[PDB]
Amino acid sequence: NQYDVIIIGSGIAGALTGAVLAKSGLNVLILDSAQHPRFSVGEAATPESGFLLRLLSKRFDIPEIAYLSHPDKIIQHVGSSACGIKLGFSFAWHQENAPSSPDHLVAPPYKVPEAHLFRQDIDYFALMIALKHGAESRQNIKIESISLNDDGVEVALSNAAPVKAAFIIDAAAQGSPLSRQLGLRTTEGLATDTCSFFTHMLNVKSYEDALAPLSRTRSPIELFKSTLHHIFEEGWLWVIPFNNHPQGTNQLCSIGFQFNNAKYRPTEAPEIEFRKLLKKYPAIGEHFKDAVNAREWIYAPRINYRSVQNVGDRFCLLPQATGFIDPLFSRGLITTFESILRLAPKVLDAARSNRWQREQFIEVERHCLNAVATNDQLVSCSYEAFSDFHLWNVWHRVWLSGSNLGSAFLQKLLHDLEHSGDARQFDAALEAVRFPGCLSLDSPAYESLFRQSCQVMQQAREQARPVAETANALHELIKEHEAELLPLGYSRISNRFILKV
Ligand SMILES: Cc1cc2nc3c(=O)[nH]c(=O)nc-3n(C[C@H](O)[C@H](O)[C@H](O)COP(=O)(O)OP(=O)(O)OC[C@H]3O[C@@H](n4cnc5c(N)ncnc54)[C@H](O)[C@@H]3O)c2cc1C
Ligand SMILES: [Br-]
Ligand SMILES: [Br-]
Ligand SMILES: [Br-]
Ligand SMILES: [Br-]
Ligand SMILES: [Ca+2]
Ligand SMILES: [Cl-]
């Protein structure tokens, strides 16, 4: 074998995987059919994704990875155009044929800033990390075939000799060639059925200028300095600025709109569907009076999928290649970074003992498949909560409380790793969590709240129950589990801006 590991895809997933494996002493080859620089979706970081990047950095002693968790460090070390700022999530609710109210808002602020990742710059920088640690990169390639044998993997290339390795990691997202050839991917069983239109734009007005200033909203954060979700019965639209950081130079704003295909199927070109949306929701339209498109729209008719398996003797599919649900709540980067964190030590142990069996990587699969199933429940129930603001307001606390517990758990793991300096103990601690792929990771009390709340939302959809009844039932569930959650006052529904500590 020419190499130890072949990685397909040189996006952030493949690049970071390549970096940690090469740093740890594997001969790595990264293959990509495109070349940098190149646009990619997946821009909103979360408290979880930030901690997971710092864990990867700390676990494998690669300081440059930790830079990617902080907007100031990205500006300083990647480049001033490589991110915008994110001080929280924000949700603004709307209804067709009614004026939009700036009191139909929720926006819980973070403790520390996070990033809106300008992926063309972040992903190239990440590949440079891998290249500096000795990973080889071959761009603009064409994979002819991937053979999986009992003594290794063989990848045939157009106009080049075959390459051989002990293991292949598919980090190629929706274009996973390993997923196509293995027949792993399916949409059977998925509660979520959504499409997406997305692009980058110039001259997108801030929420504050376009709709309502801070003095009106009473938000503790500018919605301009947040991942802003405009939600409504049949779908939602994101406003993710890169031009909201005072030290930043990026002029663009990322815009994407998603529809629940059960409620509305688009019939026309992206720009026409966009205009129809702004007519339906004029308040959303106030962002876009002077705005112009800085790339072509991308349309994806169905963004949701899962897999029945994602590891074998000689392969692993990373999360995007395995499964995706929706941009809502930004679980994609979380699932990805944690999967790398779990996979990489196991691949190192496999390469060091020369043992390559499916059972060695079973916990990577367990985490990934569980994460997609959790995210499917989370998102499908959220799309049902879009029908009414008061319902959304109560429902968002189910997600928030879970995410807050998950982030606290990852912070504690990082804290313990930094103090003990013990890598094996961290790996075991991550694997020992009682609910891998779930929002809290390890809280049985929370996962009871989550499961019961999701059952309430599905029953509400199935039986067309009134929204006031559904909201009240969720309120009582939150109250019932309060003591077991973090002491943030989640049951205080009148407080729409839940603060930390
Ligand atoms: C519309 C949309 C919005 C999203 N929004 C968010 C968000 O706000 N927050 C969040 O956390 N996550 C989001 N996600 C999920 C997020 O996109 C992923 O978690 C993340 O981009 C994964 O990065 P990656 O490096 O695995 O894949 P990518 O960044 O897509 O890179 C994959 C690479 O593989 C290459 N490739 C593809 N096919 C082949 C082939 N056959 N052979 C060789 N190479 C190939 C490509 O050229 C590309 O460079 C979103 C997803 C979608 C679809
Ligand atoms: Br740092
Ligand atoms: Br309310
Ligand atoms: Br209530
Ligand atoms: Br209240
Ligand atoms: Ca070797
Ligand atoms: Cl996502």
Residue numbers in the entry: 2 to 502
Paste lines from the article.
A bacterial halogenase PltM was originally identified as one of three putative halogenases encoded in the biosynthetic gene cluster of pyoluteorin, an antifungal compound containing a dichloropyrrole moiety. Recently, PltM was elegantly demonstrated to catalyze mono- and dichlorination of phloroglucinol, yielding, instead of a biosynthetic intermediate, a compound that serves as a potent transcriptional regulator of the pyolyteorin biosynthesis, whereas another halogenase, PltA, which acted on a peptidyl carrier protein loaded pyrrole, was shown to generate dichloropyrrole. Herein, we report the wide substrate profile and the unusually large halide versatility of PltM and its crystal structures that reveal a unique recycling mechanism of FAD.
We also validated the substrate binding cavity observed in the crystal structures by testing halogenation by two point mutants of PltM, L111Y and S404Y, in this setting. We determined a crystal structure of PltM L111Y, which showed that the overall protein structure is unperturbed and the only effect of the mutation was to obstruct the access to the substrate binding pocket, as predicted. These data further validated the structure-based definitions of the substrate binding site and suggested a potential for halogenation in a fermentation setting.
